[PDB]
Amino acid sequence: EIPVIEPLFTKVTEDIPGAEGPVFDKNGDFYIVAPEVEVNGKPAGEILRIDLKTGKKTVICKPEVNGYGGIPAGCQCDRDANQLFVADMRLGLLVVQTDGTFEEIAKKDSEGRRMQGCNECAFDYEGNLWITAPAGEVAPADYTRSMQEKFGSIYCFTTDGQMIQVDTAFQFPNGIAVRHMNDGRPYQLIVAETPTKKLWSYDIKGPAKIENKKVWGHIPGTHEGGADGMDFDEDNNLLVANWGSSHIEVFGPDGGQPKMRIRCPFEKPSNLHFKPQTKTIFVTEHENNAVWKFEWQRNGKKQYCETLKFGIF
Ligand SMILES: [Ca+2]
Ligand SMILES: [Ca+2]
């Protein structure tokens, strides 16, 4: 039987519709996105900064392009500039400044196709951004999602600014993570396909170059939902939020079946993020639409924004 641990969870903040994309910037500030905020039945998603002391929220950005509101769902902090890359289910990929100003990255990919709505993104150490796109075409196109049909795609936004679709035909690709070698070279891309209860992997051969698609891991449960967000700890164990299972699964470097499970005091864990240089993990969940934190067994794997461009070692 898979061992299960029940760490102490401390509530940080609440009342954040669809609480997602937890992220820390280069200054140590904490942000979260609220993709499910609606005004008059239309999308009006928000990007928020949270004060870790009081738990008070501040809306820094409410993305909108030509009257079309966004559904921000995933975040990554850049390294060479303190700015956030945000995956939006309606607007695609956005780059957001801490002052609240934002820019739409692309309306079409490298092959001239309309961009699809995105949900999550992950930087590899070379600066390439891997993105999951479970939604259909971005606004003004009618909103649709690949929960039932297989039209979700995977993109790679390269360092030289190219938006390349690297694969498609996924039934709601969601969480994504990059496994790196000890020397820092990116070598494995892990992608969650939510409803199918599978984690897929690819070997990374270079920027926007992936091959050897394989079923990497299996998510437990027959409940509606599945793997949502994920991140690696310093030993390369992959922690995966299993939405609807009340647990966060822990996979070893080689995948397969979970080697441990973390029971949460809520049914819908969605995403998570480690606070830099600590064992503290912040988790967002959709039962109470809140953010919690708990202590893991070790520090998290450094995010791209924590690495040095001009380092020696
Ligand atoms: Ca997600
Ligand atoms: Ca994360």
Side-chain angles (χ1 to χ4, degrees), residues 20 73 119-120 174-175 228-229 270-271:
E20 258 270 34
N119 188 278
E120 179 70 293
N174 206 329
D228 192 333
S270 172
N271 217 329

Side-chain angles (χ1 to χ4, degrees), residues 38-60:
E38 282 176 48
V39 178
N40 288 55
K42 287 185 170 60
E46 312 175 320
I47 300 177
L48 308 85
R49 174 183 299 143
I50 311 296
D51 184 301
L52 296 180
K53 296 184 174 302
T54 66
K56 288 218 64 180
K57 307 169 292 181
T58 296
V59 177
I60 64 167

Side-chain angles (χ1 to χ4, degrees), residues 187 193 307:
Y187 75 113
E193 186 176 44
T307 61

Side-chain angles (χ1 to χ4, degrees), residues 151-275:
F151 61 81
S153 304
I154 307 298
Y155 292 99
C156 178
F157 183 61
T158 66
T159 59
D160 61 313
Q162 306 316 300
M163 180 64 78
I164 305 171
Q165 192 182 71
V166 292
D167 204 2
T168 188
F170 280 79
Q171 198 175 323
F172 212 98
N174 206 329
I176 187 164
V178 181
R179 182 183 183 187
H180 297 273
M181 289 294 282
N182 265 56
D183 55 43
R185 191 270 297 193
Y187 75 113
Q188 269 197 306
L189 184 68
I190 304 296
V191 184
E193 186 176 44
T194 305
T196 67
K197 306 295 192 302
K198 296 171 188 169
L199 290 181
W200 298 89
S201 70
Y202 297 83
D203 293 329
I204 295 175
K205 298 299 182 184
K209 300 184 185 61
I210 55 180
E211 312 180 307
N212 189 33
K213 176 180 181 184
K214 170 190 66 179
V215 172
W216 189 82
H218 297 281
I219 300 299
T222 58
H223 58 285
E224 285 297 301
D228 192 333
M230 57 180 45
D231 263 327
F232 283 109
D233 68 13
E234 59 168 41
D235 288 341
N236 294 310
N237 289 306
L238 184 72
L239 285 76
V240 187
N242 189 353
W243 198 95
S245 76
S246 296
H247 296 73
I248 286 173
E249 316 297 348
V250 179
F251 287 86
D254 301 310
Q257 297 286 167
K259 70 176 181 178
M260 186 188 319
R261 312 189 77 195
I262 304 172
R263 154 144 269 187
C264 303
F266 40 80
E267 182 175 305
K268 298 169 180 178
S270 172
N271 217 329
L272 56 108
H273 209 71
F274 283 82
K275 171 178 176 184

